[PDB]
Amino acid sequence: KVFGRCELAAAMKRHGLDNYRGYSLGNWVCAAKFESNFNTQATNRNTDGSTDYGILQINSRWWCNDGRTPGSRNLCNIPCSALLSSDITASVNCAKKIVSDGNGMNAWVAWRNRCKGTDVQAWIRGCRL
Amino acid sequence: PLGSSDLGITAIALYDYQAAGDDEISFDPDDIITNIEMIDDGWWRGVCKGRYGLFPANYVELRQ
């Protein structure tokens, strides 16, 4: 599924992301835009043998188990395929672990690069929320 | 829903898989799996080459 901007904002707010760990809803929408272009099925392999999964491109070295990532942890305690669902529940629950683990939303390279320090409220303007 | 005309969620097989249960499917690398149902986080149902049933999700890559 490719989410609409406002559609995703409503779903993320429904799942408790607005101001989660102090990050306004626009941060989360923005991170999904530049991680996956809002596509729940995005899957990108890395040269270290890990892979990034789903709408927030969560990585298989620390966070989820894909069976093929050597010396990996599974700190969200889920198969990475869980992050490829059309509803965002599993990506949101995992995202809450990641953003709470000490580096806040800096865990998401596209958020650091494209969202941090921009007017992220733009990502929610015009949405009924 | 599942009854639509389109092929729904599709994937390509990355590795061989041999069905290991009465309710499973087999495929070869590069086979296409269509009409995927994400019934469980780890094992999914789908249709591959005229056969319907269960397969490990991490043996396929969603297109795209």
């Binding site: 188990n65 069976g67 093929r68 990532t69 198969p79 | 590795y15 780890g42 094992w43 490990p56 991490n58």
Partner: peptide, 13 residues
């Protein structure tokens, strides 16, 4: 070069 994966855990419940 490339890893064939371990099978995911048997379906939950």
């Amino acid at each position: 070069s490339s890893v064939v994966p371990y099978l995911p855990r048997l379906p939950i419940l």
